[PDB]
Structure 1
Amino acid sequence: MIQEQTMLNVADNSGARRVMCIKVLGGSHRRYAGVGDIIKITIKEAIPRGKVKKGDVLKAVVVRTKKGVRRPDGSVIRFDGNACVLLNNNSEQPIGTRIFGPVTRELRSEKFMKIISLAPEV
């Protein structure tokens, strides 16, 4: 459950360290974004020689949440932190070339197939 003002960790090598969600895209009065959902973000902390800089406004897809994901049998997978992967503002498509940490099977959708291939686990 990510909303505006929520800070997230970055699970790629784009160069960002901390990002803040500024909009939950999708509909009028949409409250939360979970896992596969796309959000508008602003970069709060970044490394010196990265592809992105502090203050940049772009898009990201959530990959890990503390709330977690429910499965058809009723099971739930939870993580210790909230993480997202930065996407190009225009054509989505991950800016980074490496994915760090496990992702979930909710991402395989052709839109995010590149992420699945690069993820270490699941």
Structure 2
Amino acid sequence: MIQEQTMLNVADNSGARRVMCIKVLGGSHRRYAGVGDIIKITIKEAIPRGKVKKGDVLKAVVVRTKKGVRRPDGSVIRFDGNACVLLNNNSEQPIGTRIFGPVTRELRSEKFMKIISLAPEV
């Protein structure tokens, strides 16, 4: 459950640091994003070296979420903090080249091909 506002930590490098949801893309009146839903992003902090600078607007896959995720057996993952990897606004595809921390198995898909290939676990 990510919602508008809601600061997100970023998984990939590219100087993102702190970030804020501005829209949940999907449908009319859509409320929540989690798992690996695509969303809008707007930067706040950012590193000085800057793969991307402060005040940018972007897209991002929600990855880890504090509310966790379920799946068929009733098992439930629940990461301590929300995190998303950035995406190029038109072409999609992560603009980063690394992934920090675990990502969920659920994320797997064609367009999210480049992420799960990276990252230490799951």
Q: TM-score interval w.r.t. the shorter chain?
A: over 0.9
RMSD: 0.6
Specify the alignment match of 2:20 in structure 1.
20
Other structure's SS at 2:105 match: coil
The structure with the largest strand share of the pair is 1
> Identity over the aligned pairs, expressed in percent?
100
Other structure's SS at 2:116 match: helix
Other structure's SS at 2:62 match: strand
Counterpart CA distance in 2 for 1:83 and 1:9 is 4
Deviation string 1:35-57 (CA, Å, 9 cap, x unpaired) is 21001010000000121000000
Quote the offset at 1:71 in angstroms: 1.6
Other structure's SS at 1:92 match: coil
Quote the offset at 1:14 in angstroms: 1.1
| TM-score, normalisation: structure 1 | 0.98
Counterpart CA distance in 1 for 2:4 and 2:98 is 26
Specify the alignment match of 1:98 in structure 2.
98
Deviating runs (4+, > 4 A) in structure 1? none
Deviation string 1:66-110 (CA, Å, 9 cap, x unpaired) is 000002011100000000000000011000000000000111111
Other structure's SS at 2:19 match: strand
Counterpart CA distance in 1 for 2:72 and 2:35 is 16
Specify the alignment match of 1:114 in structure 2.
114
Larger mean Cα displacement after TM superposition, 106-115 or 80-89: 106-115
Other structure's SS at 2:107 match: coil
Counterpart CA distance in 2 for 1:50 and 1:6 is 22
Quote the offset at 1:119 in angstroms: 1.1
The number of aligned residues is 122
Quote the offset at 1:63 in angstroms: 0.5
* Structure 1 residue runs without a partner (length 5+): none
* Structure 2 residue runs without a partner (length 5+): none
Deviation string 1:12-37 (CA, Å, 9 cap, x unpaired) is 11111000000000000000001210
